[PDB]
Amino acid sequence: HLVCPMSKSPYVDPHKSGHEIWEEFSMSFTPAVKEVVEFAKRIPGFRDLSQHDQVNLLKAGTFEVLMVRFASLFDAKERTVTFLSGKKYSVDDLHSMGAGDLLNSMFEFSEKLNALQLSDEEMSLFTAVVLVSADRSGIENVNSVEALQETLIRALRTLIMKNHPNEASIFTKLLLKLPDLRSLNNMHSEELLAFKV
Amino acid sequence: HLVCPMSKSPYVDPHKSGHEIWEEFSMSFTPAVKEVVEFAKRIPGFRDLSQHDQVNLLKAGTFEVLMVRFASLFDAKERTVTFLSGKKYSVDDLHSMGAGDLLNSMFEFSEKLNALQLSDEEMSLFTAVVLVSADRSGIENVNSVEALQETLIRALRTLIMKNHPNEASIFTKLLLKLPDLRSLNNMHSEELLAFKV
Amino acid sequence: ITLADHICQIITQDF
Amino acid sequence: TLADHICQIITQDF
Ligand code: HEM
Ligand code: HEM
């Protein structure tokens, strides 16, 4: 099996080689990555980072960006996951198919985030903060990224303040998701390396 | 070489077995770990958490707490690292005994954190915030941990706003250190694994 | 070490 | 799957 919901189905043909499975996987997740790229070009300060930092922020923040965007793919009430093809699989189904604790963590993250029911403006501004908050370890001009990060955060607070005048705490709740997304990312690369069993 | 400044020294006697090298090392870091435990017992709402969640917060967050208490081991002006023995070593020294990106990432972090020029009190509350922010994978009462975190965060914002009135932005910066600390934790864990393989 | 590295080729190709 | 050299020191105190 391949239980990543970027798949179009967790079901893998047992009679296809590893690289042909992976290529099928790829023509499913490749569009979603390209939309993170497109989305980055539309963050205005982003185009003003060097080419190297732009690529590095995307290399490191794409997963986090997607976890935010596709959090809606985790139905906490139905206890189902929607895969990219559109089909839904129960949690119980996926656990017997190989899934474990990262799936449960993603449901808890998604439940709490879907709970906020952010609009698309709030979300798109949130995701951009998530992108330029990517781990900085390969970044050359850290100060300029932290200045873009700082600018995008200020817009987030202003937008939240106008949209939730009586609920200021949403803003801090959104920031405190950043370490949660970073743990989901680590565990999820650990899942990727375990691809070698 | 054992280039972790929790060591007494980065020099390892080569006529020593892995298990006794680790014995001496553990002699050096175990007091700092035990001190985290005692700090935790002093954070206002920590002891009211279930026993299991206290332990799982300290299992996952001790490193990030220590990375904050020991940020002064990293002197940016001198490019030296002070080991727990008190001996000082230069980055170039450590780079040739095996150190790399994680060491540099840590100097960057210490530089940014010392820049915020916080009082001890603000530091001890930020560190409580850090601990209760630990990875939530093994946590059984998520809302109680996040309620403790949200109240510590709020307490911290009031103290930072009162003491740095020329700069409320120090609170946001502090918040954005939580994904940084999480990334150092993941980098450092990987270095730890590597030392074992 | 290996992470979202299978993503590298897609990002560089839009650059 | 690690960094749990710290467990023993922490679980002892409880
Ligand atoms: C292009 C980006 C991604 C690639 C190449 C990728 C690849 C993979 C692979 C190979 C696995 C292991 C599958 C298995 O062991 O059966 C996996 C696991 C998983 N991935 Fe992804 N993934 C990507 C992005 C994402 C995103 C954005 C999400 C969530 C929105 C996600 C959610 C999951 C989940 C829930 C699992 C299973 C966790 C568990 O076993 O508990 N992945 N991924
Ligand atoms: C009890 C807690 C800790 C243990 C058991 C531990 C263990 C280790 C081990 C085994 C290594 C690999 C050393 C090598 O390959 O030579 C390492 C690397 C390192 N650790 Fe720790 N560590 C701990 C906490 C910390 C803390 C709190 C800090 C910072 C304040 C830190 C800073 C470093 C650095 C800078 C390196 C080298 C990074 C590099 O190679 O670039 N460690 N640690």
From TrEMBL, chains A, B:
It is found in: Cytoplasm; Nucleus. It comes from the Eukaryota. Transmembrane segments: none annotated. This is Nuclear receptor Rev-ErbA beta variant 1. Belongs to the nuclear hormone receptor family. NR1 subfamily. Residues 1-197 form the NR LBD domain.
